Amino acid sequence: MPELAVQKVVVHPLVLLSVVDHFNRIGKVGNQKRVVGVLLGSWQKKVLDVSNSFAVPFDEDDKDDSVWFLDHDYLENMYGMFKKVNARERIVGWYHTGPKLHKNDIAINELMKRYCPNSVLVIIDVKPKDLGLPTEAYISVEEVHDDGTPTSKTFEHVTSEIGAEEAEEVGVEHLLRDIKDTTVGTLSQRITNQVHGLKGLNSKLLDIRTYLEKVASGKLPINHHIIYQLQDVFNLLPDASLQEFVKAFYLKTNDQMVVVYLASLIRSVVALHNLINNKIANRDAEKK
Amino acid sequence: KIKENSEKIKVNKTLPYLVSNVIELLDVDPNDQEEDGANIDLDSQRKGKCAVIKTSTRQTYFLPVIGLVDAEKL
Amino acid sequence: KQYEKSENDLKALQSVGQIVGEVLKQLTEEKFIVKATNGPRYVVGCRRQLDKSKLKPGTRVALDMTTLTIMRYLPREVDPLVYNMSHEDPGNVSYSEIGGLSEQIRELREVIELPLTNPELFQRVGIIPPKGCLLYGPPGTGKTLLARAVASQLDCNFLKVVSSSIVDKYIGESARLIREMFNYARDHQPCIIFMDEIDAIGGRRFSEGTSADREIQRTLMELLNQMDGFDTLHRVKMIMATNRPDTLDPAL
Amino acid sequence: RGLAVGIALVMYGRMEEADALIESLCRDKDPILRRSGMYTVAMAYCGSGNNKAIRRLLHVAVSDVNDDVRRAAVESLGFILFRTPEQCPSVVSLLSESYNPHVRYGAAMALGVCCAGTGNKEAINLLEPMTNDPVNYVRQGALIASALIMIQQTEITCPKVNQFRQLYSKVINDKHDDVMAKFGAILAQGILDAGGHNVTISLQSRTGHTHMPSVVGVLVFTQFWFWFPLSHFLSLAYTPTCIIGLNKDLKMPKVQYKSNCKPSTFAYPAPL
Amino acid sequence: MVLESTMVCVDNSEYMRNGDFLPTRLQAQQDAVNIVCHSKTRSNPENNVGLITLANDCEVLTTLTPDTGRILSKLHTVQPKGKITFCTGIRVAHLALKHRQGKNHKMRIIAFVGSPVEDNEKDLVKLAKRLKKEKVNVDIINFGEEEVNTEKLTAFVNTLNGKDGTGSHLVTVPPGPSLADALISSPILAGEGGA
Amino acid sequence: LREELQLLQEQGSYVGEVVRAMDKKKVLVKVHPEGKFVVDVDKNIDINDVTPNCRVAL
Amino acid sequence: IKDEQKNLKKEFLHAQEEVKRIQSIPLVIGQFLEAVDQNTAIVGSTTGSNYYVRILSTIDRELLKPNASVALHKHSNALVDVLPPEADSSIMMLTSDQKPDVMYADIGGMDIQKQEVREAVELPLTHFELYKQIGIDPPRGVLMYGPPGCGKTMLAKAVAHHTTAAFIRVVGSEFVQKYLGEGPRMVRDVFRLAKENAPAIIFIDEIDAIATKRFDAQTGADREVQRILLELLNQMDGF
Amino acid sequence: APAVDTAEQVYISSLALLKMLKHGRAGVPMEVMGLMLGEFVDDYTVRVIDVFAMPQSGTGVSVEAVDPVFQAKMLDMLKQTGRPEMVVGWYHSHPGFGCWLSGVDINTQQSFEALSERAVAVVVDPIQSVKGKVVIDAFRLINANMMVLGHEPRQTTSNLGHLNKPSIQALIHGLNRHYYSITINYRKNELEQKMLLNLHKKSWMEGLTLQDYSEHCKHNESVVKEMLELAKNYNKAVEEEDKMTPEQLAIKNVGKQDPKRHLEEHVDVLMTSNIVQCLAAMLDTVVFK
């Protein structure tokens, strides 16, 4: 059954929202354990459009990645009720409640194949992390290293985006006490995205950095593939920085002033001489 | 039960009613025509026994025909 | 059966009865502009489900009257008069009878029979195959019979048309029948279209006319444009029967 | 709803100490909890009018589109500012302009409380377009707020009471029409006539500084949009407007006092 | 028997495939699961069964349903390379029993052992403490720990009974011919409670 | 904007022209694609502020 | 208050979604006669009935002001939105899907006629600039006369085939509809398509059955033909 | 009477509003419905914990639309997770009528009404509702006979009104008779909100990401050329162009293809792009090199 069949994951704000809700309701299965649930949406296609998600009973024991319970019945029934309502609706994959990527998920992925072809690992966290979405999309990739066993089963991140239907989007606004913080639209948004990138860039460098110290002394396991890719960033070193400038706006404002001022200037000349006569008018008008 | 479901139709069913003529007789399945794919791979054509009708006011109206006297007789 | 009426009728009542339309023009395959056969033009939507490919300028759609989204697809344009003429073939008519005049039957045969199997035969010579057979002959010879007989023998789809059933009070209704008889005939090719007594459709130059004449010039006009004009007839052959042709327009 | 008003009474004359409490409540996850903060500052700050208190209510209102917090914030301002009641029509006007008619209902309330013992010219005119508006709840706020300022004054001297009487009679008779307009007309009627014109709900005490019984009764009273009985709390708010003698023997002695009145411009009113 | 959620654990090992119990164990157990399932269902039908593999990496084939068909199918095929790992099956049974399709039932584990255990003395005492605190008991039909092994189970079974409001039983089937498809003779027909 | 949907939704409209204007406080209008109708005057436009063959909205 | 504006803009944007529902289907297409004023205008829907209707958020009279298609809401008949002229043009630019059977292989002769048509019909399409410059005034319509079969249409057919474009073929019995009122409405849109994507040729096959100098004008049938001719004349100056 | 009968505010959770809308939108134009699963608290709070849809059909929003197969199946799932819920009521979309009940809706509304006096029929925004900002209202339907007895006023009490008209006075008459636009509030907490706010994780990379310099330089060049054209038109205009009415402005100050507007759009787009593209590339270069 295919694992490879993802390169884009588009998720509705509904599925992202749904996981948050399932954590509390399910009876707080999670914490040390994990709640993974099925994702309903399009499948059997490259771009994954996840319509919805619902919780499935799961008790996870993490440490030993060979022990788990997953509800066998749940996927089958749930897929059939939903199919009738919308026939795009199938089992897209499963969500993992993080906190981040693990090796324990590898073991979990194999059983999902028998039921439905999927192996997509979406890590939707209920705990706020990242300046953006605490969601990551992962596609299981096979790569060789020369530090450990040859041919390892690992996850390469594949791009995550968002969708939303038209009614559904207006609904997203309705719940919020805002519209959104960014959309990369006009003058105002566009800058907010830039400073969001910059903070997001600083967070990225630190994950990698902290990790290298730990390899250096106090050993963690390493892969040949990650270590090489990091070296490359230094080697690529930019060249020279040039170009880009504007000044256009001052003419727009300047022309605008003389058009509004045209009326003001005329009002100024009439108003001043009128000022003592106006007192008798104002009083009269005000009186009744 | 028939009267009850029919009840929404029944108000329109009474007076006034026009007469019309049959441009085409369309003999297909009794209920639910084919399902089209794309986003939601399910029906949009639900046409049972149906007739494409031209009224004699020089207007054209599409309507799914009654299962009591079917399209086929028409 | 009664329970069945209620359910199929239910689908229509959502729309408050569906309305026939046809794509006036494709601007995109999501939003189409549709002209309504009940009257006014609309800009309408399409379903996220519907195959986008089915809806075209030539074909017809049905729309919700209450929210003008293409609800569903309907087959092509048709006229009830045309549908019966094509489906039916009463009387039949024996080939033997017209016979004995046999040479005159051959000349007719070249136009009618040969392009039906293949147009290739005429293509070989270098030239398009003739359109429109005019049978004329002194009164009572067999002109109307000749058309019928060759058709009956071939067993290709045959429209026998009353020409005084083509015209009617309602204006451009008469314009619609002529393009329609050919259009049905084109769909069901190889085919023969027979109009008997072509004089009825035939008009003069007029413009001192009555309402009856007013209609006649328009049917006359449409026939020229479909028959030999920009549009052409790939294997539909048209058979005309006339007692005396001296009522028809000078262009014809 | 009941708790949200409740936290506020117990904090009475804390002043600055209430700030920490309102901020927390506002910070909270639930939209309902954000409303509860607004109460807390309203009661505590009275007997002053300070910069500190106002700034946080307004903060809530702009950050949130949300209909409840905006309307809520505007009422509490009018209480803080009634130690210089002239400031209130200027600030309340800006807020009423907004897209939400919700804010407008609160705007009506803000004015009412501020002016409740004695008002201004400006306070009445602000209220007046809302009375005419045909959105039911904006009209409702307007009519009740008007009655409060005008209290314990004769119906002849006021043209507005005479007008409002005609309006009241038609709305109460119609049975099938929306509850909020009916409720504005009646609450405002009952207030006006209140105690046969002998009880007031003072903006602040006549000794020098803020009436306690008036502030408690009036604050819960502002709520009757869901659950009606809260409005009755206005009994606690009423303050008697006469001096009463007392002496060594436990009698009342006869006290005669001068009063700015005449019986040739003021005489006992009766409604409709 | 009545208000019970059950996990039947099928042992799939290199040991469970012999001619020990005619014709071969794989067929013989298939007869055996039908008799316990049906027996419990017959008593009062309100009990359900689930299917887990005790052995190697745990796989949940089925959660609670009454269905016999699944137990019969899993049993006939067995991995050559498999062997028992008692700790993974107990861990997983307990975890599965908590969530239920029909949810009202008490927790009882029924397991087939047709293999000598491959886990040490520390492991077996550890598991017994977990079973006791949750008050979830294992009834074991044991020919496996007879094969070339000692019966470790025997001790646990005594301890567990009395205190837990579920029962444990040690059912003994001699190694070599005695049948293990004619279950009526030695009761593990239904799981008994302790309370 | 809120108000605009309410105004915007209406039964519809017609365009007629005043054929004749009475002294009975009705106005004779012909709507262009239908027949003639006799109708009472509105507040905005009546007989004194109209002259016939002036197109008027309905 | 500077913050309050920013919140009011948020409320605004959510409030905008409310106008947007009327702006979307179901909609009827009309044509803008003219703007009498901002808040209300005079419009003619594609039914042959005219309505006096409201303008949603005072749409600017710019490219709305001259004769154009506009979008109206169906159930109210109100003018919600504007459309450009290109949208809802009856038939598409023809003689690229319904090209004729004829070339200058059917006529090699009438040389003088061939020379004339190519300079007059074909060349201003290519280079309007040369054709204006020369001292012949900007393109106006051509009338072709003769006795039957002479190839008045033939030279027009021939040129249209070579070009593959800048030609709209309309049938003169396509002006007419079954149902009254629509018949002049058709004429305006098809004739308009030419104007936006100028230079473009409107070619009518046989102008007769419409170009009558006599109408009865007592039955609905006669009246309708009389309405096509009336539109035609108006539209001729319009090009 | 010792009767309850009053207006019921619907407390909608975040999963429930987004899901209902999604269904409603998917469903267009055929009328689609589904059940509201929940718990009842208080004495007018009906809480929708979750929702599921009954299949999309041309026969929906009828007593025929509710299927026992889908409902049971759906309820059974919830049990394994251990969520006990009762059928609080039902939701639907009409995309060929407004946010009012229609005639076909009445039979279904009645059956649920009799069963629970605290089951309502909720109309959920599709795309047809003219007055649609995602205004959801819940109504119950009574008849005229009941009203004159005085059953009708009870229902109307305790709610804040709001006027709509998406389908003329006939809708309004039914709207007043029902409850008259009942107030809907939403239950949310701060954690859930934040998940809905951000588009994706990838903004972190993307906000920084620049195209090619050549292309940036092209943008600047394209706008300038555009602005240069408009300039001539600005020059005549400036003498007035503060005037009301676009028709009048058309002749006077070249209100036909308005130069002020064209120039302002050109200046806004050019401005934000050029700065952000310069800033990004330059900032990245200093960190990397």
CSV table of C-alpha atoms in Angstrom, one decimal, chain C residues 21-252:
chain,number,residue,atom,x,y,z
C,21,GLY,CA,-32.0,27.0,-20.1
C,22,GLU,CA,-29.1,26.6,-22.5
C,23,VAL,CA,-25.6,28.0,-22.3
C,24,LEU,CA,-25.8,31.3,-24.1
C,25,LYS,CA,-22.0,31.3,-24.0
C,26,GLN,CA,-19.2,29.7,-22.0
C,27,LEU,CA,-17.2,32.5,-20.1
C,28,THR,CA,-15.7,30.0,-17.7
C,29,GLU,CA,-16.8,26.4,-16.7
C,30,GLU,CA,-17.9,27.3,-13.3
C,31,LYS,CA,-19.9,30.4,-14.0
C,32,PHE,CA,-21.8,30.3,-17.2
C,33,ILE,CA,-24.1,32.7,-18.8
C,34,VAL,CA,-27.4,31.1,-19.6
C,35,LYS,CA,-30.3,32.2,-21.7
C,36,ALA,CA,-33.6,30.9,-20.5
C,37,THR,CA,-36.2,29.5,-22.7
C,38,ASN,CA,-38.8,30.9,-20.3
C,39,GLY,CA,-37.3,34.2,-21.0
C,40,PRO,CA,-34.5,36.4,-19.4
C,41,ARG,CA,-30.7,35.8,-19.4
C,42,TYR,CA,-28.8,35.1,-16.1
C,43,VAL,CA,-25.2,34.6,-14.9
C,44,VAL,CA,-25.4,31.2,-13.1
C,45,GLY,CA,-23.1,28.9,-11.1
C,46,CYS,CA,-22.3,25.2,-11.4
C,47,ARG,CA,-22.0,22.4,-8.9
C,48,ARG,CA,-18.7,21.5,-7.2
C,49,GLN,CA,-19.8,17.9,-8.1
C,50,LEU,CA,-21.0,18.2,-11.7
C,51,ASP,CA,-18.7,17.3,-14.5
C,52,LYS,CA,-17.7,20.6,-15.9
C,53,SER,CA,-17.1,19.1,-19.4
C,54,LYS,CA,-21.0,18.2,-20.0
C,55,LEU,CA,-22.1,21.8,-20.0
C,56,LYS,CA,-21.4,23.5,-23.4
C,57,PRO,CA,-22.9,26.3,-25.6
C,58,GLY,CA,-24.9,23.8,-27.7
C,59,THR,CA,-26.5,21.7,-24.9
C,60,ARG,CA,-29.2,22.5,-22.4
C,61,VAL,CA,-29.1,22.7,-18.6
C,62,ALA,CA,-31.7,23.1,-15.9
C,63,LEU,CA,-31.4,25.7,-13.2
C,64,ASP,CA,-32.7,26.3,-9.8
C,65,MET,CA,-35.4,29.2,-10.2
C,66,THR,CA,-34.5,30.2,-6.6
C,67,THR,CA,-30.7,30.4,-6.6
C,68,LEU,CA,-29.6,29.9,-10.3
C,69,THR,CA,-26.9,27.4,-10.0
C,70,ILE,CA,-26.9,24.8,-12.8
C,71,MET,CA,-28.7,21.9,-11.0
C,72,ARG,CA,-28.3,19.5,-13.7
C,73,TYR,CA,-27.6,18.7,-17.3
C,74,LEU,CA,-30.5,18.1,-19.9
C,75,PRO,CA,-30.0,16.7,-23.4
C,76,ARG,CA,-29.9,18.9,-26.6
C,77,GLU,CA,-32.6,21.3,-28.0
C,78,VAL,CA,-35.6,19.5,-29.7
C,79,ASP,CA,-39.0,20.6,-30.8
C,80,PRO,CA,-42.0,18.2,-30.2
C,81,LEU,CA,-43.2,18.4,-33.9
C,82,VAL,CA,-39.7,17.1,-35.1
C,83,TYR,CA,-39.5,14.3,-32.6
C,84,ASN,CA,-42.7,12.6,-33.8
C,85,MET,CA,-41.9,13.0,-37.6
C,86,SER,CA,-38.5,11.3,-37.2
C,87,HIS,CA,-39.8,8.4,-34.9
C,88,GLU,CA,-42.7,7.5,-37.1
C,89,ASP,CA,-42.8,6.1,-40.6
C,90,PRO,CA,-46.5,5.4,-41.5
C,91,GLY,CA,-47.6,4.2,-45.0
C,92,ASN,CA,-44.1,3.0,-45.8
C,93,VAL,CA,-44.3,3.0,-49.7
C,94,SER,CA,-43.2,0.5,-52.2
C,95,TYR,CA,-40.4,1.2,-54.6
C,96,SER,CA,-42.0,-1.0,-57.2
C,97,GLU,CA,-44.8,1.6,-58.0
C,98,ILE,CA,-42.6,4.6,-59.0
C,99,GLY,CA,-40.8,2.0,-61.2
C,100,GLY,CA,-40.9,1.7,-64.9
C,101,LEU,CA,-40.0,5.5,-64.9
C,102,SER,CA,-36.7,3.8,-63.7
C,103,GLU,CA,-34.0,6.2,-65.4
C,104,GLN,CA,-35.4,9.3,-63.6
C,105,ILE,CA,-35.2,7.3,-60.3
C,106,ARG,CA,-31.4,6.9,-60.9
C,107,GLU,CA,-30.6,10.5,-61.1
C,108,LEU,CA,-32.2,11.0,-57.7
C,109,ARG,CA,-30.4,8.1,-56.3
C,110,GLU,CA,-26.9,9.6,-56.8
C,111,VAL,CA,-27.7,12.5,-54.4
C,112,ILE,CA,-29.8,10.5,-51.9
C,113,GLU,CA,-28.2,7.0,-51.4
C,114,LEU,CA,-24.4,7.3,-52.2
C,115,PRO,CA,-23.2,10.0,-49.7
C,116,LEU,CA,-25.1,8.1,-46.8
C,117,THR,CA,-22.8,5.0,-46.9
C,118,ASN,CA,-19.7,7.1,-47.6
C,119,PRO,CA,-19.2,10.7,-48.8
C,120,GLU,CA,-15.9,9.4,-50.0
C,121,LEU,CA,-17.3,8.4,-53.5
C,122,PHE,CA,-18.1,12.1,-54.4
C,123,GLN,CA,-14.9,13.2,-52.6
C,124,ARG,CA,-12.9,11.1,-55.0
C,125,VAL,CA,-14.1,13.1,-58.1
C,126,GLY,CA,-13.1,16.4,-56.5
C,127,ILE,CA,-16.4,18.1,-55.5
C,128,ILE,CA,-19.0,18.3,-52.7
C,129,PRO,CA,-22.2,16.2,-53.3
C,130,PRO,CA,-25.3,18.2,-54.4
C,131,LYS,CA,-27.8,19.4,-51.7
C,132,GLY,CA,-31.6,19.5,-52.2
C,133,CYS,CA,-33.5,17.5,-54.8
C,134,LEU,CA,-36.3,19.2,-56.5
C,135,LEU,CA,-38.9,16.7,-57.9
C,136,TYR,CA,-41.2,18.3,-60.4
C,137,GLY,CA,-43.3,16.7,-63.0
C,138,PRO,CA,-46.7,17.2,-64.5
C,139,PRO,CA,-49.6,16.8,-62.1
C,140,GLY,CA,-50.2,13.4,-60.7
C,141,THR,CA,-46.9,11.9,-61.9
C,142,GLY,CA,-45.3,10.6,-58.7
C,143,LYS,CA,-43.2,13.4,-57.4
C,144,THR,CA,-44.1,13.1,-53.8
C,145,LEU,CA,-44.1,9.3,-54.1
C,146,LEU,CA,-40.5,9.2,-55.5
C,147,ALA,CA,-39.1,10.8,-52.3
C,148,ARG,CA,-41.0,8.4,-50.1
C,149,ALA,CA,-40.1,5.2,-52.0
C,150,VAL,CA,-36.3,5.6,-52.2
C,151,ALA,CA,-36.3,6.3,-48.5
C,152,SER,CA,-38.4,3.2,-47.7
C,153,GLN,CA,-36.1,0.9,-49.6
C,154,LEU,CA,-32.9,2.3,-48.0
C,155,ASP,CA,-34.1,2.0,-44.5
C,156,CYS,CA,-32.3,5.1,-43.2
C,157,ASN,CA,-34.0,7.4,-40.7
C,158,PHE,CA,-36.6,9.4,-42.4
C,159,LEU,CA,-38.4,12.6,-41.3
C,160,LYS,CA,-41.7,13.2,-43.3
C,161,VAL,CA,-42.7,16.7,-42.6
C,162,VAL,CA,-45.9,18.6,-43.1
C,163,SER,CA,-44.9,22.1,-44.3
C,164,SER,CA,-48.1,23.8,-43.2
C,165,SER,CA,-47.3,22.5,-39.7
C,166,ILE,CA,-44.0,24.4,-39.7
C,167,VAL,CA,-45.5,27.8,-39.7
C,168,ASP,CA,-47.7,29.0,-36.7
C,169,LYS,CA,-48.9,32.3,-35.2
C,170,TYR,CA,-46.1,32.6,-32.7
C,171,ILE,CA,-43.0,34.5,-34.2
C,172,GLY,CA,-39.6,32.8,-34.6
C,173,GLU,CA,-41.4,29.6,-33.6
C,174,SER,CA,-41.5,29.3,-37.4
C,175,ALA,CA,-37.8,30.1,-37.5
C,176,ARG,CA,-37.1,27.3,-34.9
C,177,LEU,CA,-38.8,24.5,-36.8
C,178,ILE,CA,-36.6,24.7,-39.9
C,179,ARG,CA,-33.3,24.7,-38.1
C,180,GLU,CA,-34.6,22.1,-35.8
C,181,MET,CA,-35.7,19.5,-38.6
C,182,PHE,CA,-32.1,19.6,-39.9
C,183,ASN,CA,-30.5,19.5,-36.5
C,184,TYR,CA,-32.4,16.3,-35.4
C,185,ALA,CA,-31.5,14.8,-38.8
C,186,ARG,CA,-27.8,15.7,-38.4
C,187,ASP,CA,-27.8,14.0,-34.9
C,188,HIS,CA,-29.3,10.8,-36.3
C,189,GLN,CA,-27.1,10.7,-39.5
C,190,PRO,CA,-27.1,8.9,-42.1
C,191,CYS,CA,-30.6,10.5,-42.8
C,192,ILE,CA,-33.2,11.8,-45.3
C,193,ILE,CA,-35.4,14.9,-44.6
C,194,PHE,CA,-38.5,15.1,-46.7
C,195,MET,CA,-40.7,18.2,-46.8
C,196,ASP,CA,-43.7,17.7,-49.1
C,197,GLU,CA,-45.2,20.6,-50.9
C,198,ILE,CA,-42.3,23.1,-50.4
C,199,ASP,CA,-44.7,25.9,-51.6
C,200,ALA,CA,-46.0,26.4,-48.0
C,201,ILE,CA,-42.6,27.5,-46.6
C,202,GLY,CA,-41.8,29.3,-49.9
C,203,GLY,CA,-42.5,32.9,-49.9
C,204,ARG,CA,-42.0,35.8,-52.2
C,205,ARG,CA,-40.2,38.9,-51.7
C,206,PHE,CA,-43.3,40.5,-50.0
C,207,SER,CA,-43.4,43.7,-47.8
C,208,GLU,CA,-47.0,44.4,-48.9
C,209,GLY,CA,-47.9,41.2,-47.2
C,210,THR,CA,-50.2,40.0,-44.4
C,211,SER,CA,-49.2,38.3,-41.0
C,212,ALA,CA,-49.5,35.0,-42.9
C,213,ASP,CA,-46.9,36.2,-45.3
C,214,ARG,CA,-44.7,37.7,-42.7
C,215,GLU,CA,-44.1,34.3,-41.2
C,216,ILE,CA,-43.4,32.6,-44.6
C,217,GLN,CA,-40.4,34.8,-45.6
C,218,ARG,CA,-38.6,34.0,-42.3
C,219,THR,CA,-38.9,30.1,-42.7
C,220,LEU,CA,-37.7,30.8,-46.2
C,221,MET,CA,-34.7,32.7,-45.0
C,222,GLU,CA,-33.5,30.1,-42.5
C,223,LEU,CA,-33.6,27.3,-45.0
C,224,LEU,CA,-31.0,29.0,-47.3
C,225,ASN,CA,-28.5,29.4,-44.5
C,226,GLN,CA,-28.6,25.8,-43.2
C,227,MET,CA,-29.0,24.1,-46.7
C,228,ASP,CA,-26.2,25.6,-48.9
C,229,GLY,CA,-24.8,28.6,-46.6
C,230,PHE,CA,-21.9,28.8,-44.1
C,231,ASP,CA,-23.4,25.6,-42.6
C,232,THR,CA,-23.4,22.4,-44.6
C,233,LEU,CA,-25.1,19.0,-44.7
C,234,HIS,CA,-22.6,16.1,-44.3
C,235,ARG,CA,-25.1,13.3,-45.3
C,236,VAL,CA,-28.6,14.8,-44.7
C,237,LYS,CA,-30.2,15.1,-48.1
C,238,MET,CA,-33.3,17.1,-48.6
C,239,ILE,CA,-36.1,16.0,-50.9
C,240,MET,CA,-38.6,18.5,-52.0
C,241,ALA,CA,-41.9,17.7,-53.7
C,242,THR,CA,-43.7,20.2,-55.8
C,243,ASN,CA,-46.6,20.1,-58.1
C,244,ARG,CA,-45.6,23.4,-59.8
C,245,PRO,CA,-42.7,25.5,-58.6
C,246,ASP,CA,-43.8,29.1,-59.3
C,247,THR,CA,-44.7,30.2,-55.7
C,248,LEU,CA,-41.2,29.9,-54.2
C,249,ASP,CA,-38.8,32.8,-53.6
C,250,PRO,CA,-36.5,33.8,-56.5
C,251,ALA,CA,-33.3,33.0,-54.4
C,252,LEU,CA,-34.5,29.4,-53.9
